[PDB]
């Protein structure tokens, strides 16, 4: 019977956190900071998608090319198998042509 | 499982409240109930 019997402990969310009250600051650091920095230089994450958006094939092509020289040995083989699969899916399968 | 269904109990009881006066397992088992509750409607 997949439904819980006691109602869960209450989710207390501080809306005036440090990360919440100062969220969004310096997203316009270009257009009113004399264009020294782009806002794409403000995003922190992986190296291969710091300022770049693609589908799943274009992400694995970019991950193999940018950071794939220093990837682990069976993480590179799991990535090469994924590009070998997503090539065949996007180019040979599907409804529209 | 990012978001799986938490309210599936109440979707079963939308059908199973109409089947309470049936015979056999049509009043209990949901798979047998919808083929009769639809047919009763």
């Amino acid at each position: 019977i997949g439904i819980r019997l006691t109602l869960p402990p209450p989710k207390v969310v501080d809306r005036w956190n440090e990360k919440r009250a100062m969220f969004g600051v310096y997203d316009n650091i270009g257009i009113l900071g004399n264009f020294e920095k782009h806002p794409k230089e403000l995003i922190r994450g992986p190296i291969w998608l710091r300022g770049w958006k693609g589908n799943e094939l274009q992400r694995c092509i970019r991950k193999r090319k940018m950071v794939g020289s220093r990837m682990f040995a069976d993480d590179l083989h799991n990535l090469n198998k994924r590009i070998r699969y997503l090539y065949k899916h996007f180019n040979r399968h599907g409804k529209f042509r | 499982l990012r978001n799986r269904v938490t309210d599936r109990y109440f979707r079963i009881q939308e059908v199973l409240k109409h089947a309470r006066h049936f015979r056999g397992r049509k009043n209990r088992c949901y798979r047998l109930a919808v083929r009769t509750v639809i047919r009763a409607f």
Binding site: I3, R4, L5, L7, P8 | R4, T6, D7
Partner: peptide
Amino acid sequence: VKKGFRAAFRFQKELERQRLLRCPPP
């Protein structure tokens, strides 16, 4: 544990109707 609150609240109020259908108050 399925995460969420809105389905655990409704079941808490369907238990309280059955607690009055099993034991009706004076």
